Amino acid sequence: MLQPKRTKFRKMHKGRNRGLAQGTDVSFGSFGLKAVGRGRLTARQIEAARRAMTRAVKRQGKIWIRVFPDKPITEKPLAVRMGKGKGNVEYWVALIQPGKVLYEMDGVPEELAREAFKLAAAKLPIKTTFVTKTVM
Amino acid sequence: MFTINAEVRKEQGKGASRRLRAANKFPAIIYGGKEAPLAIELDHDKVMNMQAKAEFYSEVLTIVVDGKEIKVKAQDVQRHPYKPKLQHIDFVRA
Amino acid sequence: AKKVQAYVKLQVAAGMANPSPPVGPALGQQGVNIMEFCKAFNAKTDSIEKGLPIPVVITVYADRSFTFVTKTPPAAVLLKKAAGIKSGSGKPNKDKVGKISRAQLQEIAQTKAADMTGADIEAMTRSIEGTARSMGLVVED
Amino acid sequence: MKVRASVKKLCRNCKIVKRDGVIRVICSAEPKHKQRQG
Amino acid sequence: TGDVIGDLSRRRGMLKGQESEVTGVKIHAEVPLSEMFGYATQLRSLTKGRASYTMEFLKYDEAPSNVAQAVIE
RNA sequence: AGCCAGGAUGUUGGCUUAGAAGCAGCCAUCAUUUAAAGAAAGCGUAAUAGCUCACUGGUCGAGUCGGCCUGCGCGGAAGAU
């Protein structure tokens, strides 16, 4: 799974997840998967989403991943009272905003591109959509 | 060869613009020349239906306003984030 | 001359008048007593030489009399030896062997004419130069 | 019958109808394709 | 005939040709000895007891990759 | 969309030909008219035949097919006096 090699700190404050997103246009290939909801994506769902749609074309075309987990979400161990320090980091998420370009790919025909993204979307906890590169 | 129906908008602002796009119409701006810019309002539905063509971005766009029709070019499209609509277009008066 | 119930459209070898592996299914299906049928087969079998495949149509009348209108080499099997080799395919676009002319095939289209009268002399030759394409053979004149 | 909360038209002849308010899919050819509740 | 042959092919059988006499449809084929095991128990299970067969030897022909790898103990 | 005529198939086309006969799937993707016909999806099947499907030849005679953006509803929905 995807994870930051050598980041500065061990833990990070929780932080609200407001506003909109910056990645909006299908900037690399031709067919992308823009997100419509507002949540967060851990690395395991990041790995699983690509895997399902990589084998949907089985080799075909280039596939770009536009989101990377930065936020080191922690969890406390069970039967441990509150306080006593911040818990250890268990998994890494990437906070998703509305109108964010997720997984993007190229080199595939359109009808199976919408099919491959449909196989990927059901693995996501965010409602997404299939978007296409416009000019400019 | 596309033609645009439009008119001059008044009383602009943040909430004013938000009031527009919840009424199937959206604002814009026309600038470029030895004159003042023109904050022009134009129909949302019509131009969104025709932005799919490549000639919407590679042609001297014929926007008519108060009878006076001008030839402009499309600079940028500030579109809506996740809804398939759009928020603003910049028309440089070429 | 009935319908398709007893109508079998296949055969391979003239000289081998005995039920061959592909004519097996065909024969057994309609209980064809090939032995006396071989004597009727060998009236026209002797007119053609061996080495070029021959099909047959089979017609069984209502009163157990069963007859046939046999053939001469049709579309595929004649164009193959015209190229010199019976096979060499599985890769039409991926292989390129030989170049054959249509004027020489205009003569053998007339031999297919008395055999399997396929429409429009050159357009059947075009139908069958695609069987050459399907056999991985190039054709140019 | 499969009580599947999602129903997909699994074939060509599989038709989707609303019996008693409940969405039901039936098939003329394959009785394994019968399902409801979607 | 078709059923017997489908099952011949199934038991790695070479259906070859479909001959015919008067009341019977005779089909001769080549079958491995390893898949001969209990054949007439499976023959008349598919032919309502109205069929028969007789096994003869031809040759120790080729054993394919799945059949060659099996018996190696 | 149906109803009758049908399916306009050269080509049993290679191949692997034991058959893969559009109907194993790799492939050429040729061509016949250029009024109804892809060298082909699908169960069915050993393989043809097959009924169909794509397409309606003509019968009737009017509106119709599927997505898009959304308003409000259904199902998803099982707990203990």
Domains and CATH numbers, chain A: 21-136 (3.90.1170.10)
Phi, psi of B56 (to 5 degrees): -80, -20
The answer to whether A34 touches A103, Cβ cutoff 8 Å, is no
Which of E1, E8, E18, E21 is the best mutation test for C, with the most CBs of C within 10 A?
A: E18
Please provide the CATH number assigned to the domain covering C72-140.
1.10.10.250
Q: Report chain B residues whose CB lies below 8 A from the CB of A33.
A: none
* Degrees to nearest 5, angle at CA A48 with A43 and A52: 155
Task: Using DSSP, state whether E57 is helix, strand or coil.
Answer: coil
**Would you mind telling me the total number of residues written for chain D in this entry?**
38
Instruction: Find the Å distance, CA of residue B53 to C1' of nucleotide F1.
Output: 36
DSSP summary character for residue A135:
P
* Degrees to nearest 5, angle at CA B17 with B13 and B21: 175
Cα A73 to Cα A10, B4, E62, distances in angstroms: 10, 51, 62
Measured in whole angstroms, the distance separating CA E45 from the mean position of its chain's CA atoms is 14
Query: Which CATH number covers residue B86?
Result: 2.40.240.10
Say if B and D touch: at least 3 Cβ pairs within 8 Å.
no
Q: Report chain A residues whose CB lies below 8 A from the CB of B78.
A: none
Cβ of E15 near strand F (distance < 7 A)? yes
DSSP summary character for residue B54:
G
Burial classification of residue C129, based on how many CB atoms lie within 10 Å of its CB (0-12 exposed, 13-18 middle, 19 or more buried): buried
Q: What is the CA radius of gyration of chain E?
A: 14
Fold classified for C7-71 = Ribosomal protein L11, N-terminal domain (3.30.1550)
Q: Which residue of B has its CA nearest to A35?
A: B82
Domain ranges within chain C, ordered by starting residue: 7-71, 72-140
- Tell me, what amino acid is at C75? A
CA distance B59 to B36: 23
Task: Using DSSP, state whether C31 is helix, strand or coil.
Answer: coil
CA distance C123 to C112: 13
Residue of A98, A135, A136 lying closest to B81 (CB–CB): A98
CA distance E28 to E18: 8
Report which secondary-structure segment, H or E, holds C29: helix C23-29
CA distance B30 to B7: 12
User: Which residues, 6 or more positions from C20, have their beta carbon under 8 angstroms from its beta carbon?
Assistant: C12, C13, E17
Neighbouring chains of D at 3+ CB pairs under 8 Å are none
User: Which residues, 6 or more positions from E67, have their beta carbon under 8 angstroms from its beta carbon?
Assistant: E12, E32, E34
Q: How was this entry determined?
A: cryo-EM
Q: C31 — contact with chain E (CB < 8 Å)? A: yes
Q: b or e along D4-25 (b: 16 or more beta carbons within 10 Å of the residue's beta carbon)? A: eeebeeeeeebeeeeeeeeebb
D19: which strand partners? Answer: D22
Q: What angle, 0 to 180 degrees and rounded to 10, lies between the N-to-C axes of helices C102-113 and C75-83?
A: 150
Q: Which residue of B has its CA nearest to A25?
A: B81
B29: which strand partners? Answer: B90
- Residue indicated by tokens 């790695």: E12
Whether residues E19 and C19 touch (CB distance < 8 A) is answered with: yes
CA distance E53 to A115: 53
Please, which contacts does D4-8 make with residues 24 or more away whose CB atoms are closer than 8 Å?
Answer: D4/D35, D4/D37, D4/D38, D5/D37, D5/D38, D6/D38, D7/D35, D7/D36, D7/D37, D7/D38
CA distance C3 to C72: 23
Q: Which of residues 71-100 of C touch strand F (CB under 7 A)?
A: 74-77, 80, 86-87, 89-94
- Tell me, what amino acid is at E3? D
CA atoms within 13 A on the CB side of C120: 6
Q: Which residue of C has its CA nearest to E20?
A: C28
Burial classification of residue C137, based on how many CB atoms lie within 10 Å of its CB (0-12 exposed, 13-18 middle, 19 or more buried): buried
Whether residues E17 and C20 touch (CB distance < 8 A) is answered with: yes
Total domains in chain B come to 1
* Domains C7-71 and C72-140 fall in the same CATH topology: no
Helices (H), E1-73: 2-10, 39-43, 65-68
CA distance A52 to A130: 16
End-to-end CA distance of chain E: 38
Strands across the sheet with D2-3, in order?
Answer: D2-3, D35-36, D22-26, D15-19
Neighbouring chains of B at 3+ CB pairs under 8 Å are A
Task: Using DSSP, state whether C126 is helix, strand or coil.
Answer: helix
The answer to whether A103 touches A117, Cβ cutoff 8 Å, is yes
What is the structure's resolution, reported in angstroms to one decimal? 6.9
Report which secondary-structure segment, H or E, holds D25: strand D22-26
Nearest to A128 by CA among A43, A45, A18, A17: A45
User: Which residues, 6 or more positions from B87, have their beta carbon under 8 angstroms from its beta carbon?
Assistant: B21, B26, B78, B79, B80
Biggest distance spanned by C-alpha atoms of chain D: 24
User: In the structure encoding, which two tokens stand for residue B51, read together?
Assistant: 């932005």
Q: B54 — contact with chain A (CB < 8 Å)? A: yes
A131: which strand partners? Answer: A32
Sign of the alpha-carbon dihedral angle for C115, C116, C117, C119: negative
- Write the Ramachandran bin of B37: left for phi over 0, alpha for psi from -120 to 50, otherwise beta: beta
Q: Which nucleotides of F are covered by protein (CB under 7 A)?
A: 10-21, 25-33, 39, 43, 45-50, 68-70, 74-77
Say if C and B touch: at least 3 Cβ pairs within 8 Å.
no
For residues C66, C71, C75, C77, the Cα torsion angle rounded to the nearest 10 degrees is 100
Sign of the alpha-carbon dihedral angle for A20, A22, A25, A29: negative
Q: b or e along A47-82 (b: 16 or more beta carbons within 10 Å of the residue's beta carbon)? A: eebbebbbebbeebbebeebbebebbbeeeeeeeee
DSSP summary character for residue E14:
B
Nearest to C76 by CA among C67, C68, C85: C85
User: Which residues, 6 or more positions from C99, have their beta carbon under 8 angstroms from its beta carbon?
Assistant: C138, C139, C140
User: In the structure encoding, which two tokens stand for residue C79, read together?
Assistant: 């164009």
Q: Which nucleotide is nearest to D37 (CA to C1')?
A: F75
DSSP summary character for residue A56:
H
**Would you mind telling me the total number of residues written for chain C in this entry?**
141
- Residue indicated by tokens 């053979």: C137
User: Which residues, 6 or more positions from E39, have their beta carbon under 8 angstroms from its beta carbon?
Assistant: E11, E31, E53
Domain that holds residue B39: 1-94
Cβ of C126 near strand F (distance < 7 A)? yes
Strands across the sheet with C66-68, in order?
Answer: C8-9, C57-60, C66-68
Q: Three-state SS across B12-52?
A: CCHHHHHHHHCCCEEEEEEECCCCCCECEEEEHHHHHHHCC
Whether residues A129 and B82 touch (CB distance < 8 A) is answered with: yes
